[PDB]
Amino acid sequence: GATAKTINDSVVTLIERELSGVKNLLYYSATTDTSGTAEITATFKPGTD
Amino acid sequence: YSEVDLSDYLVRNVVEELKRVEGVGKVQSFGAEKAMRIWVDPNKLVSYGL
């Protein structure tokens, strides 16, 4: 029941800050829409388990 | 400016980006963000019964 802005300001930033430092991480992205949910996808280097 | 404003600017902007730099294990802030402080006088409160 929240706008994308609220979730981005409250939830996404804190999670992505710690997610940034995972080993063998090629990159990480985050998405927030009007559905009240947020997603964070961490793409690791090819060949990683 | 004053030391509250400097701390607010440090926490709001600087620290967040500094953590993003490579090799930065952690950042500990020695200042606090701005907040709405209500300093209540107990003597006045009892006068109105609140």
Contact B31, B6 (CB under 8 A): yes
The CA distance from B44 to B20, in Å, is 48
- Please indicate the experimental technique that yielded this structure: cryo-EM
Which secondary-structure segment (H or E) carries B44? helix B42-47
The CA distance from B31 to B28, in Å, is 9
The pair phi, psi for residue B35, each rounded to 5°, is -150, 160
Contact B27, B15 (CB under 8 A): yes
Q: What is the CA radius of gyration of chain A?
A: 12
**B8 residue type, one letter:** D
Q: How many CB atoms lie within 10 A of CB B18?
A: 12
Q: Which two tokens stand for residue A13?
A: 């930033």
Resolution of the structure, angstroms? 3.2
Q: Which two tokens stand for residue B16?
A: 């967040």
Contact A11, A39 (CB under 8 A): no
What is the DSSP annotation of A1-49? ---HHHHIIIIIHHHHHHHTT-TTEEEEEEEE-TTS-EEEEEEEPTT--
Indicate the length of chain B as a whole number: 50
Q: Is B19 exposed, middle or buried (0-12, 13-18, 19+ CB in 10 A)?
A: middle
